Amino acid sequence: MKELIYIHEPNILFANGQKCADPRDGLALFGPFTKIYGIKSGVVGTQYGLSIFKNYINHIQKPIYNANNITRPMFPGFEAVFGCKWDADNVVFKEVTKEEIEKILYTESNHKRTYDLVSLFINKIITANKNEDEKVDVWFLVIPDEIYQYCAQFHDQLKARLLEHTIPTQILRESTLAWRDFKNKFGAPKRDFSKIEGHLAWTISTAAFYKAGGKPWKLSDIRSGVCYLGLVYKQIEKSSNPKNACCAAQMFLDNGDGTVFKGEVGPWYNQEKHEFHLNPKEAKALLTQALNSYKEQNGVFPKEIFIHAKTKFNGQEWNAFQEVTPEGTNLVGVTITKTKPLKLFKSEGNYPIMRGNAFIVNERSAFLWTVGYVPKTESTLSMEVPNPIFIEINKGEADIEQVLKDVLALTKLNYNACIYADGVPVTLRFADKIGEILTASTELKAPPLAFKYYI
């Protein structure tokens, strides 16, 4: 019969060298891998929004329970979990007057509305940053949910125009922080976070702790000298040459912080194949950037490099990339797709297949269930039948079991959102997002920045 294999869940490391598989549990029990002294805040919103932020910040200092504390653990408390005080007293506040927002919204074209809004928030954050000595760690944009509803997205343009200046930024909606205060016509909240009230704080807290210089967790037993790079392609929609497409490299070590390397906007998108492919010149440029950054961070070139992509690879760019790879550096091309339709149903129970199961198609390709049923949380990452991702070793020599283990390992890495795990590996999880960030402003030549300035 068609046998399967199980890829055991990889533990993530926390404070004091404690390995645990649940980020929520590990953070609550032992604390983050690296602790910061504190989180200085900067709020970029209206007085109503500032009060919402302050009340929420004061309120997540006190234990928040979940309705289901098996699927989603309760939030012990910011100081109890992380060990640093995210007080609302030491918080710089940029007060956007309601007039500014409505005056900008008056614009007919959203392109301008978003631009003008993003522009205002950028100026408010910069002037506060540069002019004073306020070493605000994270700038929190508590924008009214309305701004997100109206404003091509606010997130991408804001992240790009802060990418220009390399300052961390976290965006929040008034609805997200204070959902009880926002109700529909029937007296009920537009979104009832009642049963997840403890989940939400977790998410927000971890996000903030990532953007203030802290490392929530890191993978535990990754081999020494391994570099994961995920190519991010996205075609410029307005380009005259429909082949013009941005590129990007996503260096991920065991730590999972990540580094983003921009590339040259060139004719990479192939329309007839629908696959992006770059010339040897830009291939050599991008992998030289990645290798140089790895060497200057770690003092030596990587002993292995995996270039995770959503599409296939040509011979020339692989021979390009291969030319700039040192002998010791094993260059492996892994294509990861979520399209191939193979669905495994369970014979009994309304519960789906366990996450971590895998079908090894051949020596160089395999199905991995990164979505599924988690026994620990007694829940599923998707309410639908789990769709397995196809992993194929496109180019280079590797072992498919190791590739699947690494893909699961990379998926655990997700500070943005605290969850047992995610479906896509982090190398390609924010591929579209980062691509949209890059095409939001391609003229600016960013130095290699980190995800703290992207997600």
Partner: protein
């Protein structure tokens, strides 16, 4: 028997979370801890252990104080025992309330612990911890070297006792259906010289694909004569034959056509055959962008059920029909890969034109359905597609057919999980809906 295990009494479930947190935190510092949560096999003697513990091994008695837990008689029972020992120990600060309830009013505290010094964790757990730690140190309580290793061991072994995986073989059904046999020969015909220019190969009764200057099919030389009369003059010697088994094994590479090209062509023929057979099978068609879906009309089946499985039903003011689409795949194993969709109709016959409404209703109805619903509905449809007890056939030629088994390919795994005690799938669906909003 030594008083090194600080005793933490609390409401078994009401103060459970707070205690479990406080217990493991205290342990990480090296403080030995005794509480009921750090224990797995508790029956009807555990209280006897709780006693032997409060009276013999407890340098302190920290008690979670909450309206719910101060109402619990057991809590009051533990208080009385701790007082009895506190008097014997003359510690006075032996019992240390840990007020964890915001709405708790101090007057409701028992007269036994109405005047004692209480560390407050209502403002925050972290702030109460420092005060709790400060009081413990001032009480010169003994502590060993810090050990978060012991806390980690206690967590996984107890907190995750029955939340892991089990080495138990699990057999899974799939949506891949094995293809039992193929026509022996794949035939290319030089019909072009006898084919009207601009002719469409898809319109051909039997599956036939244009490739180079050739028409590819499993059909015999004289089957398209009805559509192409000039093929009456075709010569059999001009036809190129390949044994299909060598095509599956990939052992046929020729200057005429590559192995991969011919395999893709076989896949195309298989898909066209399935579309034709479905057109013959009486199901209705939903024209998807890339493939074609097939769904049942309302009343077409017996009580909208086949094999006692509901394939057509109602959702609000909409009629949902479980439809399937098929594709071919020769590697890794020759299989037809059925896909599952839900197609909605105003009454059961007229599909709703709006793709946005289709997508929204599809997402909602899929949220409603669990593992069984999908599996049973897909199996039922194919069981209905059957032409005999074990298979159904696609008509590729007048004498040639492709046989696909109606039972999906099954996958065996060596690990499995245990079913949850409580089924919270509806709440998970609602929460995921909020996550989307």
């Amino acid at each position: 028997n030594a008083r090194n295990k600080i005793f933490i009494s609390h409401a078994a479930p009401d103060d459970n979370d707070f205690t479990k947190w406080l217990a493991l935190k205290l342990i990480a510092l090296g403080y030995e801890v005794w509480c009921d949560v750090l224990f797995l096999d508790k029956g009807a003697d555990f209280w006897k252990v709780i006693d032997k513990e409060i009276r013999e091994g407890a340098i302190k008695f920290l008690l979670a104080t909450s309206e719910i837990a101060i109402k619990r008689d057991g809590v009051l029972k533990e208080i009385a025992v701790a007082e009895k020992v506190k008097k014997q120990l003359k510690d006075d600060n032996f019992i240390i309330p840990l007020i964890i309830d915001e709405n708790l009013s101090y007057d409701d505290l028992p007269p036994e612990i109405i005047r004692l010094n209480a560390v407050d964790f209502k403002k925050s757990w972290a702030v109460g911890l420092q005060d709790l730690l400060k009081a413990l140190d001032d009480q010169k309580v003994e502590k060993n070297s810090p050990d978060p290793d012991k806390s980690n061991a206690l967590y996984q072994q107890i907190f995750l006792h029955n939340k892991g995986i089990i080495e138990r073989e699990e057999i899974y059904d799939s949506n891949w259906f094995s293809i039992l046999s193929f026509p022996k020969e794949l035939r290319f015909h030089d019909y072009e010289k006898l084919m009207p220019k601009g002719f469409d190969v898809r319109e051909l009764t039997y599956p036939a694909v244009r490739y180079k200057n050739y028409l590819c099919t499993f059909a015999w030389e004289y089957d398209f004569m009805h559509q192409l009369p000039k093929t009456e003059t075709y010569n059999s010697s001009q036809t190129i034959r390949i044994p299909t088994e060598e095509i599956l094994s990939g052992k046929y590479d020729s200057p005429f056509i590559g192995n991969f090209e011919c395999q893709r062509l076989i896949v195309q023929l298989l898909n066209k055959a399935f579309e034709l057979r479905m057109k013959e099978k009486g199901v209705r068609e939903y024209p998807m962008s890339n493939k074609m879906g097939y769904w049942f009309e309302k009343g077409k089946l017996e009580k909208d059920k086949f094999n006692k499985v509901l394939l057509v039903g109602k959702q609000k003011d909409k009629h949902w029909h479980f439809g399937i689409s098929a594709a071919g795949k020769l590697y890794p194993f020759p299989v037809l890969m059925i896909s599952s969709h839900i197609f909605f109709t105003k009454d059961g016959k007229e599909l709703i034109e709006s793709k946005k409404i289709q997508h929204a209703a599809r997402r909602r109805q899929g949220k409603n359905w669990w593992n069984d619903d999908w599996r049973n509905k897909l199996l039922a449809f194919v069981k209905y597609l059957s032409d005999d007890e074990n298979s159904f056939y696609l008509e590729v030629g007048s004498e040639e057919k492709i046989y696909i088994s109606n039972e999906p390919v099954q996958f065996v795994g060596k690990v499995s999980y245990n079913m949850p005690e409580k089924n919270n799938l509806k709440d998970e669906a609602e929460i995921s809906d909020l996550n989307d909003l």
